[PDB]
Write an enzyme that holds these catalytic residues in place. Structure first.
Site, PDB file in Angstrom:
ATOM      1  N   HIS A   1       3.738 -10.235  -9.396  1.00 55.85           N
ATOM      2  CA  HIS A   1       5.214 -10.221  -9.351  1.00 55.85           C
ATOM      3  C   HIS A   1       5.708  -9.452  -8.438  1.00 55.85           C
ATOM      4  CE1 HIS A   1       9.443 -11.279 -10.205  1.00 55.85           C
ATOM      5  NE2 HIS A   1       9.681 -10.002 -10.892  1.00 55.85           N
ATOM      6  N   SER A   2       5.542  -7.916  -8.627  1.00 54.90           N
ATOM      7  CA  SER A   2       6.113  -7.163  -7.945  1.00 54.90           C
ATOM      8  C   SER A   2       5.153  -5.727  -7.690  1.00 54.90           C
ATOM      9  CB  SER A   2       7.566  -6.498  -8.480  1.00 54.90           C
ATOM     10  OG  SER A   2       7.271  -5.887  -9.838  1.00 54.90           O
TER      11      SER A   2
ATOM     12  N   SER B   1      19.801  -8.017  -7.559  1.00 51.92           N
ATOM     13  CA  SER B   1      18.920  -8.289  -8.602  1.00 51.92           C
ATOM     14  C   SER B   1      19.146  -9.278  -9.766  1.00 51.92           C
ATOM     15  CB  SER B   1      18.471  -6.980  -9.036  1.00 51.92           C
ATOM     16  OG  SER B   1      18.362  -5.828  -8.124  1.00 51.92           O
TER      17      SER B   1
ATOM     18  N   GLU C   1       0.963  -1.131  -0.069  1.00 54.63           N
ATOM     19  CA  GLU C   1      -0.092  -0.071   0.051  1.00 54.63           C
ATOM     20  C   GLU C   1       0.946   1.146   0.090  1.00 54.63           C
ATOM     21  OE1 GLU C   1      -2.592   1.304  -1.083  1.00 54.63           O
ATOM     22  OE2 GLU C   1      -2.985   2.539   0.748  1.00 54.63           O
TER      23      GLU C   1
HETATM   24  C1  LIG Z   1      19.877 -11.876 -14.929  1.00 54.80           C
HETATM   25  C2  LIG Z   1      18.583 -11.573 -15.009  1.00 54.80           C
HETATM   26  N1  LIG Z   1      17.707 -11.140 -16.072  1.00 54.80           N
HETATM   27  C3  LIG Z   1      16.500 -10.928 -15.886  1.00 54.80           C
HETATM   28  C4  LIG Z   1      15.990 -10.318 -14.737  1.00 54.80           C
HETATM   29  C5  LIG Z   1      14.334  -9.504 -14.809  1.00 54.80           C
HETATM   30  N2  LIG Z   1      13.454 -10.570 -13.753  1.00 54.80           N
HETATM   31  C6  LIG Z   1      13.304 -10.059 -12.663  1.00 54.80           C
HETATM   32  S1  LIG Z   1      12.423 -11.215 -11.941  1.00 54.80           S
HETATM   33  C7  LIG Z   1      12.197 -12.282 -13.049  1.00 54.80           C
HETATM   34  C8  LIG Z   1      11.586 -13.509 -13.062  1.00 54.80           C
HETATM   35  C9  LIG Z   1      11.185 -14.253 -11.695  1.00 54.80           C
HETATM   36  O1  LIG Z   1      11.208 -15.609 -11.646  1.00 54.80           O
HETATM   37  P1  LIG Z   1      11.163 -16.679 -10.492  1.00 54.80           P
HETATM   38  O2  LIG Z   1      12.506 -17.301 -10.472  1.00 54.80           O
HETATM   39  O3  LIG Z   1      10.157 -17.811 -11.083  1.00 54.80           O
HETATM   40  O4  LIG Z   1      10.721 -15.877  -9.263  1.00 54.80           O
HETATM   41  P2  LIG Z   1       9.665 -15.398  -8.534  1.00 54.80           P
HETATM   42  O5  LIG Z   1       9.741 -13.922  -8.690  1.00 54.80           O
HETATM   43  O6  LIG Z   1       8.581 -15.619  -9.459  1.00 54.80           O
HETATM   44  O7  LIG Z   1       9.368 -15.892  -7.224  1.00 54.80           O
HETATM   45  C10 LIG Z   1      12.822 -11.622 -14.191  1.00 54.80           C
HETATM   46  C11 LIG Z   1      12.994 -12.386 -15.583  1.00 54.80           C
HETATM   47  C12 LIG Z   1      16.821 -10.392 -13.450  1.00 54.80           C
HETATM   48  N3  LIG Z   1      16.643  -9.773 -12.590  1.00 54.80           N
HETATM   49  N4  LIG Z   1      18.111 -11.110 -13.987  1.00 54.80           N
HETATM   50  K   LIG Z   2      21.162 -12.772  -6.821  1.00 55.25           K
END
Ligand SMILES: Cc1ncc(C[n+]2csc(CCOP(=O)(O)OP(=O)(O)O)c2C)c(N)n1
Ligand SMILES: [K+]
Ligand SMILES: Cc1ncc(C[n+]2csc(CCOP(=O)(O)OP(=O)(O)O)c2C)c(N)n1
Ligand SMILES: [K+]
Ligand SMILES: [K+]
Ligand SMILES: [K+]
Ligand SMILES: [Mg+2]
Ligand SMILES: [Mg+2]
EC number: 1.2.4.4
Lengths: 326, 382, 382, 326
Positions: free
Chosen positions: B285-286, B156, B70
């Protein structure tokens, strides 16, 4: 026929024109199917098919190797790296393979029909991994071309030029401009020469060079400059990084006698270095003041300190003052 | 045979091996959707106290997630990621851990810290980038870290911590630390080249490590059906020589048991272990993602708490109030603190500040002396 | 269950899955160490002609390998890598291929080209970097390539071609080419992040590709016992959803059969196939390696040639002579040719030469006009 | 006590001193156990153990992530990348992780006890993937230090300094010097300051800057220079690339008034750019001639064309002639 467009919309436009013209063209990357994280490929999968616009697994080194694979086939491969900050897992694939495909095969095979798009530059608070400007890293690599646009119009022309160029091209899209000011952009295909700087404001006292979002900044520093110090600045947009328009630059500097380059990317090793050192060699007689470089600090990109990190208009201006006051 | 690369009898017949994806690896579960223990022989020790800590922290995290999300929807903080539906995942594993064990994560395991009693103040401090943040507001929110609770600062770039974790585990082994290392990652991250690296090295160098995969069905917009075609992540472990198991991510007991066993054997045999916790990412997701454009742990443990008379509606009602008050109390406190002093963006690049880097420091100084009125100097420290 | 990431019944019991590495995936074999067909139901079609081509090219490669290795030991060529003990591997697979199929390799499959009738002249031309080399002497020896025999130019970075090959296969699929793509790599290269990428993408995007792994027990000094702990490479395929098989790399028939089947199904189902050919690297990793510091196909097929009365000692004796004469004849011819014109080091960087790149070209020109006496201008063309 | 050593021997020496002093130190990479492909870790596994010197799987991205992992523990990690040309698979691990470990954690964790060694520069015929000089790529990256030695003595001091520095350091070893001329090298530990250029021959007419094997080349161009044009050149060895000795350089140039930098690495984007552009800004008044850059061509490294590719002594000399004849 023309429609007003966002940077991200002009990109969908160029990408649409491409799949429309080239039966071979294919778009892929992480989360590209549903439209993308920035809405650049929205609708495209529905308009063209699941085998022309699709998601790949979450692996950038594979994404590019995969793209190089298609390209070798003569087919147009348009790979997407969600963030320029995440292009390094694929750095080997880009430098050791792609940039060297044609050369090492004596022109028997190539990935010249390969194009990689990727959100570039800073935004509100990308911090360290959603703000980088990798441009300089790829600049030290023969074989690839590196293009960065400054507006919706420039984006579509340059991108389409990239997509059709017969050389692997990296197209960096300033994500901060994706939803900025719109502008009329031709509905149909159209190109803009790669490796051609654009003077968008001639001046006579100083030459200002930048690219991406920075262009808008040096453009402002211009308004200020004359209006506050009576100095006519010639604003130049580099556009293409690797095969760079050396001439357009040196010419301007020869008329001006002073040079100020700026870019978000860190000072040390940044691209402004290659420009300075080059212009220094070429226009050595015309130079009335030491070449100036207003770049980001030699540190990673801060989350909360962004406002103090960037080469904002004030940092440039003041830098311009000291130069001129030479 | 005699071939150096593998040991196996020959075969007169040409038979390709087909992936068994229909009845893939069974999902291990201890209690049903109604907090009922299926097979008593699996019911853990777990004293009322410990079981209540698992509950209060899953719920404390949930209470915090809401207040921060929020908070994002109000421009108070720039970014945020929830844990909705994956709380059992964090708390079960963490409880099965020894506090001195090293943790390497992705960004969706704030529960691990909650369990390790991380201060609400600090959770808020990092997301706000204020002075109390030991990170000095240098990274985006949710990128937590604590050298004291042994939680390696999150970054990240996905999957990068995996190989790092294994290296860390090797160091451990050499020290005879009796310590293990846990490395969390989503099913999406597992596609990264570093995952492949991490798993192989771990097995090849015999390291005391637990690979904890959160298969929550998504990677932002991408469905698992697009991340792989094998029997998920659990089925890859063996190919690397890694003892593997799959668990009901919404069953805190199944997670706890698996984790506890993995730690025992990992530290005992210096053998890598892989745990794939099946679950579902309930929230977006965010903050930056509208999950409706492309597509429970607490409940369960609650029942188990009733069936044993370990919790009631009055007690629950009060917890909502306390946790709420407490979270909101750290919230306000983090809000009204100034962000660190601008000089901090130049420090820690290296241990010592390079002279040239210092010149840029002093430069911003001269610069602010003259134009500081155009900056948010009042918002920052000093 | 209901979890989006995998389908499987639950399980009341906590059981970690242990790698089956003792009796790993069986090694498929058609004929014994004495050219005898074990199980007749596996004996391929293969007319005398084709079977003799397999033999003559394995032996033609062997004859060539010797002449070039010695050639290296004399400073005639700068580098060289042999194929000793892995000839069956090249010829079997290649024969099972359709000539128009795309090949992506590592650097130890020169037999693939020999089978595809690559000119001895060109093999020598590349290693010598002379004018006839279509590569224009730009890469090290053994880095062959031919757009006509569809053999993607080899590069040194290990495993990089894997993901590329899969991409290529995808392109194929879209064209309805009835064409498949084969991608060779050593067991060592499989540890690379790109391998992980290659296998997953292939399965996830459903591509007509054959992954051919040469598990020869070594990666220079590194023994397989240090590259992995699972049941070799064959055991990883399934984790990715890839039909997998292991074969006796010294059995040309077992390789042929496996390859022929993989191609049929790959082009039919747009399904990736993995073949791990067990073998042993008889020679040094390269000219630059003394293999004794850290640590047969032809024979077998020969017997099979006798047992059918398809070859005799007189016939063999003559083949040694002819192949010898022929190889040595291309050898001399490649030796006495001048290397390309120095201007060729600037071309092909891009399709068109950049103006600035051209300025460097003209620069070397001015430079050689003045100091060329200090260069080997006489050795190069023009 | 001192023994005459090869570059590769001084490296084993420094590496021996390290495992000997630091109970924590560990050496790993591809084929490092049996001594290495260049004999740099010979005997070491026997003298110290299988868990202190060992082979890793063939995966550079894992090798570095693994190294970063150990380092975080406070333990000394000495990773080896067989060839500098093969360090790109690990570029992400180096730039996004290592170079940013300390910074992003506010000094809560670091991989400062991490060191990466790797054969650098060209050799007889490395062609494209056994000849590269990646130095410039890493130069645009805050957080890591980059060191390149020019002889057995410099190698051991610098390396040991790197191994003990509290910052991730990349140590590039010119493979062409591994078996070149020997020289007395202290048997026991000893360090050489990182980030300190070394003037090995003062001159008064021109300042020559290079590193690695190139140093020996600019050293020859010196002999020639004076002896054929009566010009006293001040030869400087940069040693450290990223945190570079800006001062030692600018000082010399101020005394000289002319600057010529050279390096095998390609011109465009190469490190000579950052030096030129910097000296230009600093010694703008002292500069009597345009700064000169004698680098490799903007192409991949040729197999058979190496002799024509490199900035040999003749290319430098002639470049010196034109400069001076300014
Ligand atoms: C090397 C890299 N490529 C792309 C991204 C952008 N990105 C951030 S979160 C995400 C997907 C989330 O995947 P998952 O491992 O299933 O985790 P969740 O957030 O669903 O728990 C991506 C592609 C990143 N952070 N790092
Ligand atoms: K990491
Ligand atoms: C990315 C990369 N890292 C390192 C090397 C150096 N290298 C060359 S060959 C080799 C090992 C060979 O391995 P394997 O795949 O088993 O093939 P083989 O030569 O044994 O058939 C290594 C490590 C390389 N070429 N590329
Ligand atoms: K292109
Ligand atoms: K390759
Ligand atoms: K260090
Ligand atoms: Mg997920
Ligand atoms: Mg091998």
């Amino acid at each position: 026929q023309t429609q007003k467009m966002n940077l991200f919309q002009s990109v969908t436009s160029a990408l649409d024109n491409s799949l429309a013209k080239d039966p071979t063209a294919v778009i892929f990357g992480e989360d590209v199917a549903f439209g993308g994280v920035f809405r650049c490929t929205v609708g495209l999968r529905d308009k063209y098919g699941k085998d022309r616009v699709f998601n790949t697994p979450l692996c950038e080194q594979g994404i590019v190797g995969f793209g190089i694979g298609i390209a070798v086939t003569g087919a147009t491969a348009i790979a997407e790296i969600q963030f320029a900050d995440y292009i390094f897992p694929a750095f080997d694939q880009i430098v050791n393979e792609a940039a060297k495909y044609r050369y090492r095969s004596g022109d028997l095979f190539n990935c010249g029909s390969l194009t990689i798009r990727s959100p570039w530059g800073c935004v509100g608070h990308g911090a360290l991994y959603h703000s980088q400007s990798p441009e300089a890293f790829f600049a030290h690599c023969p074989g690839i071309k590196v293009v960065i646009p400054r507006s919706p119009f420039q984006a579509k022309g340059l991108l389409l030029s990239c997509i059709e160029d017969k050389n692997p091209c990296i197209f960096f899209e300033p994500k901060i401009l994706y939803r900025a000011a719109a502008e009329e952009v031709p509905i149909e295909p159209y190109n803009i020469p790669l490796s051609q700087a654009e003077v968008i404001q001639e001046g006579s006292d100083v030459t200002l060079v930048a690219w991406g979002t920075q262009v808008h900044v040096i453009r402002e520093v211009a308004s200020m400059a004359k209006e506050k110090l009576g100095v006519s600045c010639e604003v130049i947009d580099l556009r293409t990084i690797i095969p760079w328009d050396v001439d357009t630059i040196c010419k301007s500097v020869i008329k001006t006698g002073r040079l100020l380059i700026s870019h978000e990317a860190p000072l040390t090793g940044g691209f402004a270095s290659e420009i300075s050192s080059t212009v220094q060699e070429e226009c050595f007689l015309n130079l009335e003041a030491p070449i100036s470089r207003v770049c980001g600090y030699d540190t990673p990109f801060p989350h909360i300190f962004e406002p103090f990190y960037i080469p904002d208009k004030w940092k440039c201006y003041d830098a311009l003052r000291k130069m001129i006051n030479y | 045979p005699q071939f150096p690369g593998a040991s196996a009898e020959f075969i007169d017949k040409l038979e390709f091996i087909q992936p068994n994806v229909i009845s893939g690896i069974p999902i291990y579960r201890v209690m049903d959707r109604q907090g009922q223990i299926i097979n008593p022989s699996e019911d853990p020790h777990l004293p009322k106290e410990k079981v209540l800590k698992l509950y209060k922290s899953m719920t404390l995290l949930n209470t915090m997630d809401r207040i921060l999300y929020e908070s994002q929807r109000q421009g108070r903080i720039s970014f945020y990621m929830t844990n909705y539906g994956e709380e059992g995942t964090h708390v079960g594993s963490a409880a099965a851990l020894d506090n001195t064990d090293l943790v390497f994560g992705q960004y969706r395991e704030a529960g691990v810290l909650m369990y390790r009693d991380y201060p609400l103040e600090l959770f808020m401090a990092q997301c706000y980038g204020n002075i109390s943040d030991l990170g000095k507001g240098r990274q985006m929110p949710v990128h937590y870290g604590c050298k004291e609770r042994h939680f390696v600062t999150i970054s990240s770039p996905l999957a990068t911590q995996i190989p790092q974790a294994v290296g860390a585990a090797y160091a451990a082994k050499r020290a005879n630390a009796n310590r293990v290392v846990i490395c969390y990652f989503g099913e999406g991250a597992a596609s990264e080249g570093d995952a492949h690296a991490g798993f192989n090295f771990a097995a090849t160098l015999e390291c005391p490590i637990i690979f904890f995969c959160r298969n929550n069905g998504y990677a932002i917009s991408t469905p698992t059906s697009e991340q792989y075609r094998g029997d998920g992540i659990a089925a890859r472990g063996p190919g690397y020589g890694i003892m593997s198991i799959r668990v009901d991510g919404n069953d805190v007991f199944a997670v706890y048991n698996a984790t506890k066993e993995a730690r025992r054997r990992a530290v005992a045999e210096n053998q890598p272990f892989l745990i794939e916790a099946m679950t579902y990412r309930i929230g977006h997701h965010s903050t930056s993602d509208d999950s409706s454009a492309y597509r429970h742990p607490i409940s369960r443990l609650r029942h188990y708490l009733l069936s044993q008379g370990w919790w009631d509606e009055e007690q629950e009602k009060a917890w909502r109030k306390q946790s709420r008050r407490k979270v909101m109390e750290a919230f306000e406190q983090a809000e009204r603190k100034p962000k660190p002093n601008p000089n901090l963006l130049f420090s820690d690049v290296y241990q010592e500040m390079p002279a040239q880097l210092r010149k840029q420091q002093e430069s911003l100084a001269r610069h602010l002396q003259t134009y500081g009125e155009h900056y948010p100097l009042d918002h920052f420290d000093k």
